[PDB]
A paper describes a structure:
Platelet–endothelial-cell adhesion molecule-1 (PECAM-1), also well known as CD31, is a 130 kilodalton protein which belongs to both type I transmembrane glycoprotein and immunoglobulin (Ig) superfamily. PECAM-1 can be divided into three parts: extracellular region which contains six immunoglobulin-like (IgL) domains with nine potential N-glycosylation sites, transmembrane region with one single α helix, and cytoplasmic region which possesses two separate tyrosine residues (Y663 and Y686) described as immunoreceptor tyrosine-based inhibitory motifs (ITIMs). As a cell adhesion molecule, PECAM-1 functions principally in cell junction but also plays a role in leukocyte trafficking and immune response. Among adjacent endothelial cells, PECAM-1 interacts with homogeneous molecules in a trans-homophilic binding manner that does not rely on transmembrane and cytoplasmic regions.
To avoid the uncontrolled glycosylation in insect cell expression system that might impair crystallization, we mutated three potential glyco-sites on IgL1-2 (N52Q, N84Q and N151Q). The whole structure of IgL1-2 was finally determined to 3.0 Å resolution where one asymmetric unit contains two IgL1-2 molecules (chains A and B) forming a dimer. The homodimer of PECAM-1 IgL1-2 displays a trans-binding pattern that relies on the interactions between IgL1 and IgL2 derived from two opposite molecules. The two IgL1-2 fragments are packed to each other in a face-to-face antiparallel pattern with the side face of one β sheet. There are two interacting surfaces, one between IgL1 of chain A (IgL1-A) and IgL2 of chain B (IgL2-B) and the other between IgL2 of chain A (IgL2-A) and IgL1 of chain B (IgL1-B). After analyzing the interaction surface of IgL1-2 dimer, the solvent accessible areas buried in interfaces on chain A and B are 1079.0 Å2 and 1094.2 Å2 respectively, and there are two types of reciprocities consisting of hydrophobic interaction and hydrogen bond. On interface1 (IgL2-A-IgL1-B), residues including K158, N187, F188 from IgL2-A and L74, L81, E117 from IgL1-B form the core of the hydrophobic interactions, while N115 from IgL1-B forms satellite hydrophobic interactions with I190, R149 from IgL2-A by donating C and O atoms on backbone to reinforce the hydrophobic contact. Similarly, interface2 (IgL1A-IgL2-B) residues including L74, I112, K116 from IgL1-A and R149, P155, F188, I190 from IgL2-B form the hydrophobic center while the C/O atoms from N115, Q84 on IgL2-A and N187 on IgL1-B form satellite hydrophobic interactions. Thus, the hydrophobic binding core surrounded by hydrogen bonds gives rise to the homophilic dimerization of IgL1-2. No interface was found in one asymmetric unit except the “bridge” contact. In contrast, our structure shows trans-homophilic dimerization of native IgL1-2 in one asymmetric unit, and the last peptide chain 214–228 in IgL2 does not swing out from its own architecture (Sup Fig. 3).
Author numbering:
A (entry chain A): 31 to 65, 68 to 228
B (entry chain B): 31 to 65, 67 to 229
Write the structure that this text describes.
Amino acid sequence: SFTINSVDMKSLPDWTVQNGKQLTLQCFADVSTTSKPQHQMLFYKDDVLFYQISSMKSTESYFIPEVRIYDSGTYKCTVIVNNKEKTTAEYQLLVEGVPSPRVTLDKKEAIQGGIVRVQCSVPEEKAPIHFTIEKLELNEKMVKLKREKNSRDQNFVILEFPVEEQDRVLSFRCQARIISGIHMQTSESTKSELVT
Amino acid sequence: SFTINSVDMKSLPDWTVQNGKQLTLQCFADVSTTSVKPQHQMLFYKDDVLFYQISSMKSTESYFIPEVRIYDSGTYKCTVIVNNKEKTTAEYQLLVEGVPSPRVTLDKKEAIQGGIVRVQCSVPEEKAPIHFTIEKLELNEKMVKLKREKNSRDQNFVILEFPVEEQDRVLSFRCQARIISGIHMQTSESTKSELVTV
């Protein structure tokens, strides 16, 4: 006969992981037998099934090449043998850090009084993302203007910016934030362009 | 100077699809411009949640689902960006039809009187929520000896224990699964045979 002794869920490299790395989720099962069993394993994230495998081996794995904060959450894995169950404790996977964001400008040469639509997207992540956008000024070395913006439905923003008669050479720099249980920030990003 | 004329979102073969088949979602954009081929950024959403992101130079981009499942069914919209101008498709309602035949599993191949038989019925290609029906059937009798209904909010399978009567010695169980969408879908049967001793 059989015995589901106990069940684990290891996380390689850890239950906390730097954004961008690869991550592996394991489901271990200790099984006692009197001469060899097939397992069925179900991986849940937040009690929603996302992977299913039936194998002869006691450790089963799930590979994430590129961890993202959207992957962060509550993980449990259930193992069935000969229609007997047992369920791992809950495991909280924590993803840290935000990739540098992508800034984009409709113009690279702009006129005075006019406008310049500036996009800032974190393409490798999903909403909700908070942005901070500084309008920087080169011939003066001073931040003219800052915009905070919260992006509920999207992972990007397009802001209109006015060309004040005040200068001719300027760039915009951006920085994004996302949550994992506490809060995560990026490095900056910029692109240059000029005014008449 | 660019102008996004319009954007659509076609579905191959259709916005209604049989469970199990391959499906292609396209995001098209009509672009008029006075210039220089433009760069596109397209965002595929499901239920107003993003699932695919791609930047291309051609106007049509695709997303392939090799085996559609009802869990993939939902509201699909796609918004495309060119030169930091937006436009978002209408919403599209994709509908998936049919449930795969379920998979029945028995802890015993031989059971003794009065004892139990744990019966699993799983639909592994689909996710919760699933309604199951498990009948204990009889070869020498062909009448339903016993039925168990069960709804599974959390799981894509059920394990019901069944009693072995003394009335019989060889019996099989048959199962059929249901999932609802506002419209509900049924499966075919599944069975596996096994017997009893004194």
